[PDB]
Amino acid sequence: QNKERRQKILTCSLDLFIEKGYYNTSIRDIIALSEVGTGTFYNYFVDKEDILKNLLEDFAKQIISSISEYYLVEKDLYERFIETKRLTMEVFAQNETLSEIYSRVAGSSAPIDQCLKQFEDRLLEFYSRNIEYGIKKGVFKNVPVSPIAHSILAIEKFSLYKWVVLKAITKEEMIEMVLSFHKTLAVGLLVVN
Amino acid sequence: QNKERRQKILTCSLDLFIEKGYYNTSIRDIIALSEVGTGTFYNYFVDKEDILKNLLEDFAKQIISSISEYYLVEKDLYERFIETKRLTMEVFAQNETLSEIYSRVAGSSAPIDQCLKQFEDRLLEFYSRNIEYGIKKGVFKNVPVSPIAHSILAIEKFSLYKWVVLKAITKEEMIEMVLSFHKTLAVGLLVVN
């Protein structure tokens, strides 16, 4: 019941962010469209940034649990390396309107960048754990991990932006690009080493 | 003389974008701070987006010519692969205030995204030509090129943003991350292939 209401406020907030723009949307607009009352709203959120953190927490959680669930059945670490990128790209697509907001508000102001930083740091740490595991199991080379986690995040962010914001590529083209890059990263660009 | 004036308008525009924010800055503010007169201003630019395109054209041009000049002396394609990323990261640092604007206005509106798209497409095409050359010379594997060019651009964009906007890493850490990733991309993440 706390779940329903929390969810109603988040869906309405997302819709208003898409329709009016994140900065042009007020807590007033959200409370009015949510209809939960000013007092109940504050049992959950203090302002817009609290709403954005909560939207992105749920998002990170869905990405990380989809991957972790897949790990229970597929054990080949290379198969995991590729397919987890497709999985992630599909979570983005299931949350299209949020992917859009994520892709539009980066670098806009320090409080919003602080929110995106918590979301991104969480994904980066997870990606690091999984790369570390592969190094330990002799499948991946023992290289610095943080640059690799950042490269995964970066291409995912950039290709999402080109699909959902620029409309310059299709969902399919975005998925293909991302998988192709991870394949090449895995096998290595150099012919000889 | 056309050069001096064009340059004065661009420097002033950059300063106002940093100080007031790109959207809060008007052509009025720029013409007033530039002092070139309303009529002369229009011999060069029709609006802010014309100024942004011109700032980014010069930027792309400086990145591409630094790399092309280096190519006249270093012929090892792997040495080029790494060091060109350091060169690029240094051009970003020499144009810190522009790197900031670039890192802040992405996804903000379709006209500004159209401007960034021309800048990014230009870099992507150049990066593609250089990867293609390496494939043809047997140094790089024959893989799809566009995902690789996008991955180079993406990590460069993302690590620039974390330095100049988030202030979460140092210039040095940004340069190291980017070089480390390109090294791993080159040698390949997998132990065996």
Side-chain angles (χ1 to χ4, degrees), chain A residues 2 4-27 29-124 126-175 177-193, chain B residues 2 4-27 29-124 126-175 177-193:
Chain A
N2 287 80
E4 267 143 8
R5 285 180 177 182
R6 187 192 167 263
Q7 192 57 51
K8 198 189 181 200
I9 300 160
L10 299 177
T11 319
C12 295
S13 294
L14 214 34
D15 296 348
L16 281 166
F17 292 168
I18 291 297
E19 179 189 313
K20 306 181 51 163
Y22 179 91
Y23 289 107
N24 300 316
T25 305
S26 66
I27 298 143
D29 303 337
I30 298 170
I31 65 168
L33 194 73
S34 209
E35 284 155 312
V36 299
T38 58
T40 313
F41 177 87
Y42 285 114
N43 289 336
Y44 306 92
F45 312 112
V46 201
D47 73 15
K48 278 188 292 184
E49 285 67 50
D50 284 317
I51 287 161
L52 184 61
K53 285 184 217 266
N54 280 256
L55 286 164
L56 297 166
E57 278 166 9
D58 286 3
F59 201 20
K61 188 181 182 190
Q62 187 190 346
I63 296 171
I64 294 175
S65 65
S66 302
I67 293 175
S68 305
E69 284 154 17
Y70 176 51
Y71 281 15
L72 300 173
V73 58
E74 178 65 60
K75 304 287 161 189
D76 185 90
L77 302 185
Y78 175 74
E79 193 78 29
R80 292 182 174 193
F81 188 66
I82 304 310
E83 270 312 300
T84 49
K85 306 308 169 283
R86 168 154 36 220
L87 276 181
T88 301
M89 281 345 261
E90 299 283 359
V91 176
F92 290 159
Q94 279 153 22
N95 297 255
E96 188 163 324
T97 59
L98 180 50
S99 289
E100 208 184 314
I101 294 302
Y102 171 55
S103 300
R104 290 189 171 283
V105 304
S108 63
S109 73
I112 281 64
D113 282 315
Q114 285 169 177
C115 298
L116 268 63
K117 191 179 174 295
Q118 298 182 30
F119 170 71
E120 288 181 336
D121 281 355
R122 184 165 171 195
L123 292 182
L124 289 160
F126 188 59
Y127 298 163
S128 297
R129 303 297 82 85
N130 306 144
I131 291 150
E132 288 175 39
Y133 187 77
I135 292 170
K136 286 281 177 259
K137 304 299 288 184
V139 173
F140 301 147
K141 294 183 178 69
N142 187 9
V143 294
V145 175
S146 176
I148 308 315
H150 282 88
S151 76
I152 299 168
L153 188 48
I155 195 43
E156 287 179 340
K157 266 177 89 76
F158 189 44
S159 76
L160 184 51
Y161 155 88
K162 294 191 61 149
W163 168 57
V164 78
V165 173
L166 297 195
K167 321 279 183 215
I169 58 176
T170 60
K171 182 185 143 145
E172 183 59 63
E173 287 168 341
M174 165 190 71
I175 293 169
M177 175 184 292
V178 167
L179 302 177
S180 182
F181 158 74
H182 289 90
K183 172 206 63 64
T184 300
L185 169 57
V187 301
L189 186 58
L190 290 173
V191 166
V192 190
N193 63 263
Chain B
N2 287 80
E4 267 143 8
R5 285 180 177 182
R6 187 192 167 263
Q7 192 57 51
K8 198 189 181 200
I9 300 160
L10 299 177
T11 319
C12 295
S13 294
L14 214 34
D15 296 348
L16 281 166
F17 292 168
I18 291 297
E19 179 189 313
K20 306 181 51 163
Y22 179 91
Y23 289 107
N24 300 316
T25 305
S26 66
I27 298 143
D29 303 337
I30 298 170
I31 65 168
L33 194 73
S34 209
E35 284 155 312
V36 299
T38 58
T40 313
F41 177 87
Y42 285 114
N43 289 336
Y44 306 92
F45 312 112
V46 201
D47 73 15
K48 278 188 292 184
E49 285 67 50
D50 284 317
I51 287 161
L52 184 61
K53 285 184 217 266
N54 280 256
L55 286 164
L56 297 166
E57 278 166 9
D58 286 3
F59 201 20
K61 188 181 182 190
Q62 187 190 346
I63 296 171
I64 294 175
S65 65
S66 302
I67 293 175
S68 305
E69 284 154 17
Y70 176 51
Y71 281 15
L72 300 173
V73 58
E74 178 65 60
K75 304 287 161 189
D76 185 90
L77 302 185
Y78 175 74
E79 193 78 29
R80 292 182 174 193
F81 188 66
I82 304 310
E83 270 312 300
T84 49
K85 306 308 169 283
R86 168 154 36 220
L87 276 181
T88 301
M89 281 345 261
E90 299 283 359
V91 176
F92 290 159
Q94 279 153 22
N95 297 255
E96 188 163 324
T97 59
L98 180 50
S99 289
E100 208 184 314
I101 294 302
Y102 171 55
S103 300
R104 290 189 171 283
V105 304
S108 63
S109 73
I112 281 64
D113 282 315
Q114 285 169 177
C115 298
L116 268 63
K117 191 179 174 295
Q118 298 182 30
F119 170 71
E120 288 181 336
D121 281 355
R122 184 165 171 195
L123 292 182
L124 289 160
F126 188 59
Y127 298 163
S128 297
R129 303 297 82 85
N130 306 144
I131 291 150
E132 288 175 39
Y133 187 77
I135 292 170
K136 286 281 177 259
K137 304 299 288 184
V139 173
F140 301 147
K141 294 183 178 69
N142 187 9
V143 294
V145 175
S146 176
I148 308 315
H150 282 88
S151 76
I152 299 168
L153 188 48
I155 195 43
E156 287 179 340
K157 266 177 89 76
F158 189 44
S159 76
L160 184 51
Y161 155 89
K162 294 191 61 149
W163 168 57
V164 78
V165 173
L166 297 195
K167 321 279 183 215
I169 58 176
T170 60
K171 182 185 143 145
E172 183 59 63
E173 287 168 341
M174 165 190 71
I175 293 169
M177 175 184 292
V178 167
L179 302 177
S180 182
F181 158 74
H182 289 90
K183 172 206 63 64
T184 300
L185 169 57
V187 301
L189 186 58
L190 290 173
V191 166
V192 190
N193 63 263

